Scaffold this active site. Structure first.
Site, PDB file in Angstrom:
ATOM      1  N   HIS A 149      -9.484  11.059   0.889  1.00 50.00           N
ATOM      2  CA  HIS A 149      -7.960   9.300   0.460  1.00 50.00           C
ATOM      3  C   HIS A 149      -6.742  10.102   1.941  1.00 50.00           C
ATOM      4  CE1 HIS A 149      -5.364   7.135  -0.950  1.00 50.00           C
ATOM      5  NE2 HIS A 149      -6.246   6.434  -1.525  1.00 50.00           N
ATOM      6  N   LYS A 153      -4.498  10.521   4.525  1.00 48.35           N
ATOM      7  CA  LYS A 153      -4.274   9.490   5.706  1.00 48.35           C
ATOM      8  C   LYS A 153      -3.248  10.723   7.258  1.00 48.35           C
ATOM      9  CE  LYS A 153      -4.252   6.541   2.205  1.00 48.35           C
ATOM     10  NZ  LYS A 153      -6.476   6.456   2.210  1.00 48.35           N
ATOM     11  N   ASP A 204      -2.399  19.246  18.140  1.00 47.64           N
ATOM     12  CA  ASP A 204      -1.871  20.400  18.941  1.00 47.64           C
ATOM     13  C   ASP A 204      -0.939  21.110  18.446  1.00 47.64           C
ATOM     14  OD1 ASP A 204      -2.847  19.340  21.649  1.00 47.64           O
ATOM     15  OD2 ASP A 204      -0.960  18.534  21.646  1.00 47.64           O
ATOM     16  N   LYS A 218       2.930   4.439  -0.855  1.00 48.73           N
ATOM     17  CA  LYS A 218       3.580   5.236  -2.099  1.00 48.73           C
ATOM     18  C   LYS A 218       4.725   6.121  -2.303  1.00 48.73           C
ATOM     19  CE  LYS A 218      -1.152   5.205  -1.401  1.00 48.73           C
ATOM     20  NZ  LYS A 218      -1.157   3.691  -1.789  1.00 48.73           N
ATOM     21  N   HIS A 237       0.400  -0.807   0.046  1.00 49.02           N
ATOM     22  CA  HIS A 237       0.017  -0.398  -0.185  1.00 49.02           C
ATOM     23  C   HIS A 237       1.118   1.351  -0.236  1.00 49.02           C
ATOM     24  CE1 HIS A 237      -3.197   2.741   1.050  1.00 49.02           C
ATOM     25  NE2 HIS A 237      -4.024   2.446   0.785  1.00 49.02           N
ATOM     26  N   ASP A 269      17.606  10.444  -5.744  1.00 54.83           N
ATOM     27  CA  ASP A 269      19.251   9.886  -5.330  1.00 54.83           C
ATOM     28  C   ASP A 269      19.627   9.332  -3.524  1.00 54.83           C
ATOM     29  OD1 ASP A 269      19.654  10.422  -8.058  1.00 54.83           O
ATOM     30  OD2 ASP A 269      20.071  12.680  -7.663  1.00 54.83           O
TER      31      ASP A 269
HETATM   32  C1  LIG Z   1     -10.529   4.144  -2.819  1.00 54.52           C
HETATM   33  C2  LIG Z   1      -9.797   2.641  -3.716  1.00 54.52           C
HETATM   34  C3  LIG Z   1     -10.028   2.061  -2.986  1.00 54.52           C
HETATM   35  N1  LIG Z   1      -8.973   1.369  -2.113  1.00 54.52           N
HETATM   36  C4  LIG Z   1      -8.055   1.542  -2.323  1.00 54.52           C
HETATM   37  C5  LIG Z   1      -6.737   0.830  -1.038  1.00 54.52           C
HETATM   38  C6  LIG Z   1      -7.357  -0.311  -0.385  1.00 54.52           C
HETATM   39  C7  LIG Z   1      -8.809   0.098  -0.509  1.00 54.52           C
HETATM   40  C8  LIG Z   1      -9.822   0.244  -1.221  1.00 54.52           C
HETATM   41  C9  LIG Z   1      -6.844   0.448   1.294  1.00 54.52           C
HETATM   42  O1  LIG Z   1      -6.438   1.766   1.889  1.00 54.52           O
HETATM   43  N2  LIG Z   1      -5.414  -0.437   0.811  1.00 54.52           N
HETATM   44  C10 LIG Z   1      -5.385  -1.238   0.303  1.00 54.52           C
HETATM   45  N3  LIG Z   1      -6.820  -1.513  -0.919  1.00 54.52           N
HETATM   46  C11 LIG Z   1      -7.339  -1.800  -1.293  1.00 54.52           C
HETATM   47  C12 LIG Z   1      -8.074  -1.814  -2.140  1.00 54.52           C
HETATM   48  C13 LIG Z   1      -8.147  -2.951  -3.379  1.00 54.52           C
HETATM   49  C14 LIG Z   1      -7.527  -4.140  -2.994  1.00 54.52           C
HETATM   50  C15 LIG Z   1      -6.526  -4.508  -2.000  1.00 54.52           C
HETATM   51  F1  LIG Z   1      -6.468  -5.765  -2.739  1.00 54.52           F
HETATM   52  C16 LIG Z   1      -6.432  -3.438  -1.647  1.00 54.52           C
HETATM   53  N4  LIG Z   1     -10.122   3.003  -5.246  1.00 54.52           N
HETATM   54  C17 LIG Z   1      -9.559   3.002  -6.373  1.00 54.52           C
HETATM   55  O2  LIG Z   1      -8.252   4.765  -6.222  1.00 54.52           O
HETATM   56  C18 LIG Z   1      -9.406   2.531  -7.238  1.00 54.52           C
HETATM   57  C19 LIG Z   1      -8.487   2.605  -8.258  1.00 54.52           C
HETATM   58  C20 LIG Z   1      -8.338   1.744  -9.015  1.00 54.52           C
HETATM   59  C21 LIG Z   1      -9.717   0.582  -9.391  1.00 54.52           C
HETATM   60 BR1  LIG Z   1      -9.908  -1.430 -10.436  1.00 54.52          BR
HETATM   61  C22 LIG Z   1     -10.612   0.094  -7.824  1.00 54.52           C
HETATM   62  C23 LIG Z   1     -10.643   1.450  -6.806  1.00 54.52           C
END
Ligand SMILES: C[C@@H](CN1CCC2(CC1)C(=O)NCN2c1cccc(F)c1)NC(=O)c1ccc(Br)cc1
Length: 584
Positions: A412, A414, A419, A128, A126, A133
Site C-alpha cells: 500500500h 506510495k 539516487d 492521510k 484520499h 499544534d
Molecule cells: C486497498 C483499498 C482499496 N482502495 C482504497 C483507496 C482507493 C482505491 C481502492 C485509492 O487508491 N484511491 C481512491 N480509492 C477509492 C476506493 C474506494 C472508493 C473510492 F471512491 C476511492 N482497500 C481498503 O483499504 C478498503 C477498506 C474498506 C472498504 Br469498505 C473497502 C476497501
C-alpha cells in the site's frame, strides 16, 4: 517563504531546508508515533482521512482503552484540545463514514468532524494527515483505519476486558481484503472472518513525520480544505464549526535533517484551487535521476494515450531507461507492486470486474500493447530491458490448520526513492485518479537530503543521503531477508551482482511459492479456461504439509517476480456503461 505566488514544481509551498523528517515502514511505528504526538498536543489536532476507524488501537497488544484512537482524542479534548477532522463521504463502499463521524463527535464537544463531498461524484478525498499544534505533521499512505497496523513480521495468523489480551488485531482489524470486505463497522470487536481458518492479508505501507515549516504548510492545506468545506452545506456554515487560521511565526520524535517540500493534488471540487504538484515532482525526479529509481506503489497505471490514460510517469521512466541505454549508463528501475488489487474478488474464478479493470490498465502500462513500458524498451534494446527494470511483488507464508498457508503482502506504500538522495512519500498512487489534480485530492512531501553518508554506487564511492539511504536499505533488507542472510551487501543498489541477486531471488521465490501453493497470480494461467482447470488441483501445501514445509525452507525474503503473463490471453475489461476512468 511566501504563499502569494506558486513555487518549484508549481506547488503552493516552497521547499523547507533544515526540516527534521523521519520515515516509517509499516503501520507499527507510524501509529505508535502518532499516539506519542497526540499525547503531547497542547492546542489543536488536524486529521484528514479517506477512512477513519474510531476504535483502532494505536499500540499493540491492547491491554486497556489506552492508546485506542478514540479514547486518546477524547482525553485530549477533555483538556481543551480542539480536534478537527476531515473525512471522505463515500457513496453508500461500506466504510460507513457516518458511524465514524457520529462516534467521534459523541466523544466530546471539542471534537468536530466534517464530511465531504455531499454532491455525487466519482472522486474521493484520499490524503492521510494528522497535524499536532501546526508544528508536527504525519502523512503518507496510512489511514487511522482497520487493517493497517503491521510490522516486519507480516504475521499471517493471530490466534493467541483486555488485561490478558494477546491478539494484535482485535475484531474488525483482522481481515483479508481480497477474501471479504468489511461489514458491520459499528460492531468493532466482532470478527467478520474466521480467525481459525482464514489468514490475515499483511499490509505494507510507508509514512513520514515532518516538523517545523512543512508541518505549517500541511496545516495550511487542512485549514483551506476546512474553511472551503464549511461553505459546502448549510449545517457546516453555522458557528459550531469555527473557521481555522494558520500559525505564522516561530516554527518530537527522532528525525533527519533534510530539505522538505510539501506537494498536493487538489481541484475546484475538492479545495479552492487547482494543483498537480505531486505529478510535477514525480516527473522531475525521474527526469533528473542519475543512478536508480525505487518505486513502491499500490497502483501503476500510466503511459498516456491522450484519451483513457493521461499522466506521463511511465513515459518518463521509458525515456530515462532509453537514455541510459543510449549513453551506456548503469541505471536500474525497481517497481514494487501488490500482486493483486485491493478489492473483494475470488481470484480462482478470475477475480471480480474491479480486479480485472485494474489488471487491464496495469498490464497495458507494464507489457501489453504499443504504449507499454516493456514493448517500447524491447523495440529499442531487445532483451537488455531486463538490465534496466525489475517489476516485483511480495508474498509470505505461515502455518494455519496444521499446514503451510501463503498470502501476498499488500503493498500500500506510495513512495519513490531516487539516487539514495531524494524521496517522495504521500498518499498519491501512480494513476490518473491521484496525479491529475482534477480528481482525487492527495498529499505528498518531497524530501531532499542535505547530509550524506559514505556508500557505493556501481562500485564507485558515493555520498548517499542519510534519510533516503536508510529508507531504501530498510526496504531492501526486509524485502530480501537480510536478517536471515547477514552476508548481504546492500550498499550498492545498481551494480550487476546486486541486481542479479535481486532478480534471482524474485525468480527462485516465485518458483517455490508456485510449486507449494499454486498461488495466483501466476504465469502458469494465461487464460480463464486454463485457469479453471488449474485451480481444480489440490496444492502441495495441503497434500503433504511436511514436504511443503521442507521446500519452503529455500524461500529467502518476500520478493517475488510480478507475473507479466497472468491471463494475458483475456481482454479483462468488463462490459459496461461505467466510465473506464473510474479505475485509472
Ligand atoms: C486497498 C483499498 C482499496 N482502495 C482504497 C483507496 C482507493 C482505491 C481502492 C485509492 O487508491 N484511491 C481512491 N480509492 C477509492 C476506493 C474506494 C472508493 C473510492 F471512491 C476511492 N482497500 C481498503 O483499504 C478498503 C477498506 C474498506 C472498504 Br469498505 C473497502 C476497501
Amino acid at each position: 517563504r511566501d504563499f502569494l505566488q506558486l513555487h518549484r514544481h508549481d506547488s503552493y509551498a516552497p521547499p523547507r531546508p533544515g526540516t527534521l523528517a523521519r520515515w516509517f515502514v509499516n503501520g507499527a511505528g507510524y501509529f505508535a508515533a502518532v499516539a506519542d504526538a497526540i499525547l503531547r498536543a497542547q492546542e489543536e489536532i488536524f486529521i484528514t482521512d479517506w477512512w477513519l476507524s474510531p476504535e483502532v488501537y494505536l499500540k499493540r497488544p491492547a491491554h486497556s482503552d489506552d492508546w485506542r484512537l478514540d479514547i486518546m482524542l477524547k482525553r485530549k479534548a477533555e483538556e481543551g484540545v480542539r480536534v478537527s477532522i476531515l473525512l471522505f463521504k463515500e457513496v453508500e463502499l461500506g466504510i460507513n463514514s457516518g458511524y465514524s463521524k457520529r462516534a467521534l463527535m459523541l466523544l466530546h464537544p471539542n471534537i468536530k468532524v466534517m464530511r465531504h463531498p455531499d454532491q455525487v461524484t466519482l472522486w474521493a478525498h484520499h490524503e492521510k494527515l494528522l497535524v499536532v499544534d501546526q508544528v508536527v505533521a504525519f502523512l503518507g499512505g496510512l489511514d487511522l483505519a482497520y487493517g493497517r497496523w503491521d510490522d516486519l513480521h507480516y504475521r499471517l495468523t493471530d490466534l493467541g476486558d483486555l488485561s490478558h489480551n494477546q491478539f494484535f488485531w482485535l475484531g474488525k482489524d483482522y481481515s483479508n481484503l481480497i477474501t471479504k470486505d468489511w461489514v458491520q463497522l459499528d460492531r468493532p470487536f466482532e470478527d467478520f472472518i474466521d480467525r481459525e481458518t482464514t489468514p490475515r492479508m499483511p499490509w505494507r505501507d510507508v509514512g513520514v513525520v515532518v516538523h517545523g515549516l512543512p508541518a505549517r504548510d500541511l496545516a495550511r492545506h487542512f485549514i483551506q480544505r476546512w474553511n472551503f468545506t464549511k461553505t459546502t452545506k448549510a449545517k457546516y456554515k453555522t458557528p459550531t464549526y469555527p473557521y481555522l487560521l494558520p500559525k505564522s511565526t516561530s516554527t518530537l520524535p527522532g528525525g533527519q535533517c533534510t530539505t522538505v517540500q510539501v506537494l498536493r493534488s487538489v481541484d475546484r471540487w475538492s479545495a479552492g484551487t487547482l494543483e498537480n504538484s505531486i505529478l510535477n515532482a514525480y516527473l522531475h525526479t525521474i527526469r533528473e535521476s542519475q543512478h536508480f529509481l525505487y518505486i513502491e506503489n499500490q497502483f501503476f497505471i500510466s503511459c498516456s494515450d491522450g484519451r483513457t490514460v493521461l499522466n506521463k510517469v511511465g513515459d518518463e521512466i521509458v525515456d530515462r531507461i532509453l537514455k541510459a541505454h543510449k549513453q551506456g549508463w548503469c541505471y536500474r528501475v525497481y517497481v514494487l507492486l501488490p500482486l493483486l488489487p485491493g478489492f473483494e474478488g475470488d481470484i480462482s474464478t478470475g477475480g471480480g470486474n474491479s480486479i480485472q479493470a485494474i489488471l487491464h490498465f496495469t498490464y497495458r502500462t507494464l507489457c501489453r500493447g504499443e504504449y507499454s513500458i516493456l514493448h517500447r524498451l524491447k523495440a529499442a534494446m531487445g532483451t537488455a530491458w531486463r538490465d534496466y527494470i525489475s517489476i516485483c511483488g511480495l508474498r509470505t507464508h505461515g502455518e494455519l490448520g496444521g499446514h503451510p498457508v501463503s498470502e501476498l503482502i499488500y503493498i500500500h506504500s506510495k513512495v519513490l526513492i531516487a539516487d539514495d538522495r531524494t524521496v517522495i512519500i504521500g498518499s498519491a498512487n501512480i494513476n490518473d485518479r491521484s496525479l491529475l489534480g482534477k480528481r482525487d485530492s492527495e498529499l505528498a512531501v518531497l524530501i531532499e537530503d542535505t547530509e550524506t553518508e559514505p556508500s557505493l554506487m556501481n562500485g564507485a564511492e558515493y555520498q548517499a543521503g542519510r534519510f533516503a539511504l536508510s529508507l531504501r536499505k530498510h526496504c531492501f533488507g526486509v524485502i530480501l531477508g537480510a536478517n536471515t542472510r547477514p552476508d548481504l551487501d546492500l550498499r550498492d543498489p545498481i551494480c550487476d551482482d546486486f541486481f542479479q541477486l535481486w532478480q534471482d531471488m524474485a525468480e527462485s521465490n516465485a518458483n517455490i511459492y508456485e510449486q507449494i501453493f499454486r498461488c495466483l497470480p501466476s504465469n502458469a494461467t494465461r487464460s480463464l479456461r486454463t485457469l479453471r482447470e488449474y485451480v481444480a488441483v489440490e496444492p502441495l501445501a495441503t497434500v503433504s504439509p511436511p514436504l511443503a514445509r521442507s521446500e519452503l525452507t529455500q524461500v529467502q525474503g518476500h520478493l517475488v517476480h510480478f507475473p507479466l503473463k497472468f491471463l494475458e490471453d483475456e481482454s479483462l475489461l468488463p462490459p459496461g456503461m461505467i466510465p473506464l476512468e473510474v479505475w485509472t
